[PDB]
Every structure is written in C-alpha cells, then in structure tokens.
Amino acid sequence: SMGLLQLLSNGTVLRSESIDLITQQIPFKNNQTVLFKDSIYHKPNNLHLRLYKPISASNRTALPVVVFFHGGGFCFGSRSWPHFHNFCLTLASSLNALVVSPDYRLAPEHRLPAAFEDAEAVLTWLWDQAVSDGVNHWFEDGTDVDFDRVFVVGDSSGGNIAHQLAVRFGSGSIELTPVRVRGYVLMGPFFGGEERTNSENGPSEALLSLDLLDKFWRLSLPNGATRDHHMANPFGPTSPTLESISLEPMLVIVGGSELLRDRAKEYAYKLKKMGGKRVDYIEFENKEHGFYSNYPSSEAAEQVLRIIGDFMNNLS
Amino acid sequence: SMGLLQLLSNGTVLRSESIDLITQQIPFKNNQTVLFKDSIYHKPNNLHLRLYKPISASNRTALPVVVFFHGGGFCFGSRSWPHFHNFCLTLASSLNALVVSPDYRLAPEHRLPAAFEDAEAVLTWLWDQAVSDGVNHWFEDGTDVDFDRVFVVGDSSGGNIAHQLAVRFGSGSIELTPVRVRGYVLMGPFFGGEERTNSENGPSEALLSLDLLDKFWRLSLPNGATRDHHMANPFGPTSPTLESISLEPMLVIVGGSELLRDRAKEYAYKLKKMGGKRVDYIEFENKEHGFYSNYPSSEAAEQVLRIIGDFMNNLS
Known part of the structure; x- marks a missing residue:
C-alpha cells in the first residue's frame, strides 16, 4: 500500500460487528428518462463535459443549471464512471435540472490549480453557449435553459473547486452575464491542514x-507546499481574507462520522460569522464520506437531493 | 493514461446522444437489517473476509452460504469498498444467505495464481469453521449455516476465480466435506485470449x-505469459481438457453490450457440449459490465438477484 490504487485497495477492518438497513425490491417503481451527451469544453486539453436533460420537464419549463464537479482527490475519477454518471442521472431527474458534469485535469500529472482553472473554463464555456444560442445544438431537439439559475454542486475535490469558484465570483474577479451562479453546494468538501482536527485523528x-x-494532498498541491496552502486550507496564513468577499448562498453537507466533518464545520461556521453569508451546515449522523452517492437507495441520499432542491427553489 | 488508475480515470466519450431510465423516490420502502463482521482467514498474508447475515431469517431457518469474490482485474478492489459492500448487503438480504466476502492478493505485486490459492484458503477456512463449530463466534449471537449449501458467486476476476474452484472440485483435487459447493455463478467472467473476439473489437x-x-492481463499473468495462459484462457493450448471434469451447475450472466460477452458465451456453450454439465447462459441486452452492481436500482439488477436465488433454490 504505497501507490494510491494499492492503498485504496488495501481495505479497512471493522473493529466490531456492525448493522446496516437495506431497501428491498418494489414491484411498481416509477420511471423517468434522462437524455445525456458528451462535448469537449476545452480543446487544447481535450477536456469533455457531459450534459444531462430530464426528457420529462424539457417540454414543461426552463431548466435551471447544475454544474456537478466530481470527487477523487484531484487524482482520479471521470464523469463517465458509473458511480458519478448515476449520481448525475439522479441530480437531473430529482432536481429537474440541466446537469453539466465536467472532467478536469488530475494529479500528479496536472497539479493544482489545473482543476480550478478548468472549472473556470467550464463556466466560460457556459457563457459562450449562453450568448450564441448553442443550447439548440446541445441535443437533437431543443433545450430551454435558465442561465440566471446556475448552481454549483461539488463532491470532495469538487467542493473545493466550488469554493474556489465562489470566491472568484464573490471577489468580482470573474463575471459571466448572462450566467449567474445563485448558489454553491459543497458535499464533503476536500479541505486540508497541517494540523489535524479531532475527526481527522x-x-x-x-x-x-x-x-x-x-497522499491526495502530497500528489495534488504544487511541489514544496504544505496542507496549509490556500488551495487546500481556506483559512490559515492563506491570502483569502474572505471577510470582504460577498459570497452567495452556500450549503455544506457532510457525514457525521467522516474525517473531513470537523474542518468542514469550521469552514461553515467561520463563513457564518463573516456576515452577509447565507451558509447552512447540514451534518448527517452515522454517515461517512459520499453517503449520498455510495448508497443511492438510502433515506439519507434521498434527503440530500430534497435539501438541494429546496435550496435551489428558494433562489429563483 | 499509462498507469492503471490514470487510464481508468481517462474516461470514455459517447459518440452519440443517449437515454437512460432512472427510478425515483418511493415513500414507503421496505427495510431489512443485515449484520456484518470482518475476520482474518489467512494470517501469514493478513487476508480478511467479511461475513454477512440477514438478521431477519437468522431466527427462521438454516442459512445457505454464498462466497462472493469481487472484481477488478486481479489488480484492485476490496470487500470494504462501498461498491462491493453494498452488493453483498443486497446478496445477503435478497438471497437470504450468509455471505462470505473475501479479499485476495492483488497484482502486480502478488500475480496469479495468488488469488486462486487465496480463494482455496477461503474454502479451507470454511472447512475449519464447519468442523469446529466456529459459527457461534461468527457473531455475538448464534448463526445457523448449511455448509452443504455453498455457492460461489464471482464478479469479473472473481468469476475466473470461481471457475478455477469449479475445476478443482470437479477434478476431485480438493474435497472439503462437510462443505459442498452446489453451484457456481460467474458474472462477467474475466477470461482472455491473444485473439480478440468480435465484442472485444x-x-x-x-x-x-x-x-x-x-493491461489487467499484463499486470496479472506471470511474467512471460500470453493472454492464452490457461489462468486467463480456459480453452486454448491450455492443459484443462475439462471434457473429463464433472463440473457442478453453473450460471453465466453477462451484459449484451460488453466486451467480455463473446468469450463468456463461448465458455458457456463449450461447457454445454462437454456433457454432464448444467450450464445456463444469460445475456442481459443493452447492458455493459457490472450492470447488476453499478445500477443497483434497475430492472436488470433486481432480475439478476432473482435468477441466482432460483438457481440456488433448485439445488437444495
């Protein structure tokens, strides 16, 4: 267990007998179809994104936009992975949203801030599309999108990416009218620090x-850096003061039993005291990283979707 | 994309717009609990297995045994991965079975036939347990197991492992009374060959x-070997004649759209003509590798479980 995949495949040992609640087969389940297609968003780096559209409500009303950024440790993952693909299927139909699921450059080959710069390129791509009526060539038929209703949903690494975007918009550094990101949703945000928190220990x-x-941070931060690099720690000797930045509504969802929990709660509560910041913090108890996507059938996964939808509906 | 994880994270590009059917939230789902624990089965190699027990029918009747061998390419994976853990949750409750979910040594560090020898060690472990009443210390409470009703379920690499076991029992090389494996279920069996089949191309x-x-085979077969090594190709210049071996009932389940489909059908139909071999072949159309476990909510996943249960019920 020295390489990433090896260490990942090393495994964990339950110290104790454990119980889990499983959902059984329902005979008359309900169905939606969801249309999906892949398009290159950044030709020099040959980066693709996948676009999703619930067929059902594409005839009903204009679709809000959910940019989903996948997890990993800035070191693995793809939109085309069934894990993430399936999550986006669920996002599209559950939220009734056009979903944008980009790949970004991964480490240790393309180290930070590649992902951050790629995430921006996705938004810029969206801007180009919005001001050129490219949504008609998004699919064989016609998609109606509300570019004034964009939301960024990030998992692990994508939650950091999301925060990186949230700062860049709030600082006024980037502005992409007619595109307006009305909210961020950091799910298990991948922040770090030289100091452990309790949950980390x-x-x-x-x-x-x-x-x-x-290991993720060692492979991902630029050479020489520590886990207190601003790109990892949003609040150390890190330039972002953020007490001046006007951040948009934010939702921090984390698992109760997860290592990142404490750093992600600190993040949430610091932003809440910086004022002018609608920042909710939601901790799901007895849940670990990725519960919403690892266990798609569970009470928690279903609840996470409803919360994000309610967050999105409140910003219209 | 030269290393395995990199290539895995490289991604695929849909050449075309595609549609998928998604299942939505049901408000009054049904619940089972399932108890699970980890135990070392092989101390020198510090290999663990996880044991699962549906709490519901542990008071009802003796539980058959399903040894689940996970996938990967003999190169990654663990029982503790939510992907596989969740599948086993489903196996336990859906089949009403004590499930045994072993880790095995992975390549390129421990190359074949490590997994095959580890799989045997699992069975031997089971034998020790059967003849020593260790099932009482399996969990805090008491488990009742039918060791005359053991079944081997393999995914990808585990399907090869399963076939490797099926030969070793059928050849009379290994015998572990009171343990009797009554059936094998190879799901997407990981066989290979220097020649491509059509599906592979x-x-x-x-x-x-x-x-x-x-890449899997290059990392997994012993140094110098080709994809026609018996450990990969069950029918080339490979010693196993198998026309003499008495194999037990077998089920080959594969996806219609999957690369391994053709080699796995050839396998099935060759065994069917070798006589004295109850070998069913089930192809799920429009389905790719791992459909049963990647998309746990789908009509196909649910159907796969029912077929395996019916196979198991027919051997009592």
Missing part, C-alpha cells in the same frame, strides 16, 4: 483514511 | 476498454 472510514487524505 | 463500454483488459 478519529476512526478511519470504510475507505477514507488520514493517510489517504495526506 | 467492438465499442468500448463506459469504463471497460480493450486496452484496459490487456
């Missing part, structure tokens, strides 16, 4: 360990 | 590609 999860988190 | 899947399959 607490029990490993099924899959995430403190070793694995440090 | 056909379109990449979401995740599996022909490059990725060759």
